[PDB]
Amino acid sequence: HHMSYTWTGALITPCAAEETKLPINALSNSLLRHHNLVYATTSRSASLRQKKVTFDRLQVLDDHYRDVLKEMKAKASTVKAKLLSVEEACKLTPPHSARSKFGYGAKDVRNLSSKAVNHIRSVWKDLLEDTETPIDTTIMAKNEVFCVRKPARLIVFPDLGVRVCEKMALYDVVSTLPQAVMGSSYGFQYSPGQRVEFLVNAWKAKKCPMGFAYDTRCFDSTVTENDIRVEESIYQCCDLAPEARQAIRSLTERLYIGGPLTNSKGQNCGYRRCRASGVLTTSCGNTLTCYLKAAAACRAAKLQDCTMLVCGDDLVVICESAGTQEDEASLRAFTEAMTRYSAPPGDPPKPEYDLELITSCSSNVSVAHDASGKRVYYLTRDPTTPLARAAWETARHTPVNSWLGNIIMYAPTLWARMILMTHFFSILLAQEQLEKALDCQIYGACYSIEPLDLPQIIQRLHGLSAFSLHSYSPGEINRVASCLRKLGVPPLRVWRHRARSVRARLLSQGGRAATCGKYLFNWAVRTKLKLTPIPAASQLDLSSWFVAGYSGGDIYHSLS
Numbered sequence: 170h171h172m173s174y175t176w177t178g179a180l181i182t183p184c185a186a187e188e189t190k191l192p193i194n195a196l197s198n199s200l201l202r203h204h205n206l207v208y209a210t211t212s213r214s215a216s217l218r219q220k221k222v223t224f225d226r227l228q229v230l231d232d233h234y235r236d237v238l239k240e241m242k243a244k245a246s247t248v249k250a251k252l253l254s255v256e257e258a259c260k261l262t263p264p265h266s267a268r269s270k271f272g273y274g275a276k277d278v279r280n281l282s283s284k285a286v287n288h289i290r291s292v293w294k295d296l297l298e299d300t301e302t303p304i305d306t307t308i309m310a311k312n313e314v315f316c317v318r319k320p321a322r323l324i325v326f327p328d329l330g331v332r333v334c335e336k337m338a339l340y341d342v343v344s345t346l347p348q349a350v351m352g353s354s355y356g357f358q359y360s361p362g363q364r365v366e367f368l369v370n371a372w373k374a375k376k377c378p379m380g381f382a383y384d385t386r387c388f389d390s391t392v393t394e395n396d397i398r399v400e401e402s403i404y405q406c407c408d409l410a411p412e413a414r415q416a417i418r419s420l421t422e423r424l425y426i427g428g429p430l431t432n433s434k435g436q437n438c439g440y441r442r443c444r445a446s447g448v449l450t451t452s453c454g455n456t457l458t459c460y461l462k463a464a465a466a467c468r469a470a471k472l473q474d475c476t477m478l479v480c481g482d483d484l485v486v487i488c489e490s491a492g493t494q495e496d497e498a499s500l501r502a503f504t505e506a507m508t509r510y511s512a513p514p515g516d517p518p519k520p521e522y523d524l525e526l527i528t529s530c531s532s533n534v535s536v537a538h539d540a541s542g543k544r545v546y547y548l549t550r551d552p553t554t555p556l557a558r559a560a561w562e563t564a565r566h567t568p569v570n571s572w573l574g575n576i577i578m579y580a581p582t583l584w585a586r587m588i589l590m591t592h593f594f595s596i597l598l599a600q601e602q603l604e605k606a607l608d609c610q611i612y613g614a615c616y617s618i619e620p621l622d623l624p625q626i627i628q629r630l631h632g633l634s635a636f637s638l639h640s641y642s643p644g645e646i647n648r649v650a651s652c653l654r655k656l657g658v659p660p661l662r663v664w665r666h667r668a669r670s671v672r673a674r675l676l677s678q679g680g681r682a683a684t685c686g687k688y689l690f691n692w693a694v695r696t697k698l699k700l701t702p703i704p705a706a707s708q709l710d711l712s713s714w715f716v717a718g719y720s721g722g723d724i725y726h727s728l729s
């Protein structure tokens with residue numbers, strides 16, 4: 170047997186009181202009236218998840234797997250990465266990162282306090298000197314908001330001191346290596362606008378395109394000890410500082426391959442023998458491992474002219490069709506291979522012949538036209554979870570604000586423009602907090618963003634057309650309308666009226682507030698201002714953006 174986890178029987182315990190019901194609040198109710206549909210997960214459902222994530226892994230590797238691995242290693246040897254200093258790693262720590270068991274918190278780390286730095290230095294030295302002793306981890310039930318119920322997701326993470334050391338050893342590796350190894354297939358390197366262009370190009374370049382998303386069942390749990398050792402072998406192909414090599418070796422043996430699980434009450438909950446969901450390498454490791462397995466499976470299945478796009482455990486393949494029945498057979502062969510590699514599917518993949526019908530990372534491509542009449546493709550999603558979360562975050566102050574990330578990531582969409590932007594700029598205006606920087610998440614990492622910079626951020630990530638899409642697709646119109654009815658969200662007509670008021674108030678303030686009124690809410694007015702490129706937009710330093718943070722979220726960047 171080769172189980173993802175073993176358990177003692179000790180419970181996964183909360184760190185505080187956990188709310189399950191959406192609070193009834195006047196502001197939140199102006200967004201969403203059917204509050205009974207909205208719930209937050211809690212530790213009370215943790216045992217159901219434990220059952221789901223615990224299973225035997227079977228893995229058999231073949232020539233296709235080893236051939237791709239050899240190629241990946243050759244490419245990794247063209248990478249150089251540096252150690253981060255204590256201070257650099259400290260400043261990548263989000264302010265609400267979990268505090269250390271050893272007498273300090275995230276703010277102490279961020280302020281370079283002597284206690285924090287001294288402990289981090291001691292942990293680093295211990296990684297260099299000890300390559301064997303398993304490192305402790307905490308296991309927690311996540312508290313996440315959904316519309317109706319899902320059991321809580323689990324997160325597994327080491328102490329804050331270790332997390333800072335991970336950054337020192339590996340931040341520059343995870344930031345640099347995947348592009349070199351996977352090329353254009355590395356999904357996190359693209360902005361949303363670049364991602365759509367890549368997909369449309371890839372689709373439209375085929376004579377007869379076929380595409381599918383591949384859903385691996387509980388990916389972290391399918392990741393074997395050998396997978397994690399293979400990942401390390403790829404990291405070690407880089408040109409690294411001697412201390413980096415040692416710390417990576419130590420982290421792999423002591424933390425990444427497995428270790429003990431401790432609850433918030435300090436009790437031994439069990440042992441992990443699979444991917445930790447809350448370590449620095451979770452996203453990069455999953456991406457490399459998913460790519461390796463999938464690339465090998467493509468060859469096993471004899472798929473023709475494959476284009477792969479990989480974001481962690483999320484995979485899309487676009488290829489040349491051989492005919493419907495032939496494609497069905499190839500997908501079965503693909504699934505068989507992934508299964509042999511210990512990446513069995515949740516829902517078996519289905520061949521799709523319409524690009525807009527593929528869903529990956531909860532998203533699909535759709536089409537509109539911009540102010541110039543040009544056809545524009547963009548990424549959208551069902552707005553249910555975004556709106557449910559926005560309602561919760563309106564009722565309750567939350568440390569990380571999903572609504573801001575959703576505005577940024579889904580800026581071109583009908584629902585982000587008409588509902589999210591209107592709702593939150595109305596509240597920020599009323600509360601006089603337009604200037605206040607807020608923490609949000611983009612690609613699972615944490616960003617401090619000033620709402621007043623949104624026009625420039627949107628232009629950089631999506632292009633100028635984000636501010637003028639019209640003629641949304643009937644499917645998209647209907648999905649949005651169905652969502653609003655289900656959740657009890659006011660009609661778009663109401664949002665238009667609210668936005669006109671928000672826009673006028675913003676324009677009156679001048680400065681960036683006025684830019685927000687002009688660009689974000691031009692859709693709301695009959696007499697539309699001519700929107701030209703915002704010159705200051707190119708000033709934003711996005712060099713260090715898009716490093717993936719799933720599922721720990723423990724990377725921080727402030728927009729500069």
Ligand SMILES: CNC(=O)c1c(-c2ccc(F)cc2)oc2cc(N(CCO)S(C)(=O)=O)c(C3CC3)cc12
Pocket residue numbers: 356357360361364368380478479480483484485524527528529530531532533534548578579612
């Ligand atoms: C392998 N899959 C992919 O690369 C992604 C697809 C996708 C690809 C092909 C297809 F046919 C349909 C959809 O949509 C995405 C949306 C996001 N975003 C949000 C995800 O939370 S976003 C809108 O910011 O770009 C991301 C973010 C995580 C990097 C990744 C993807």
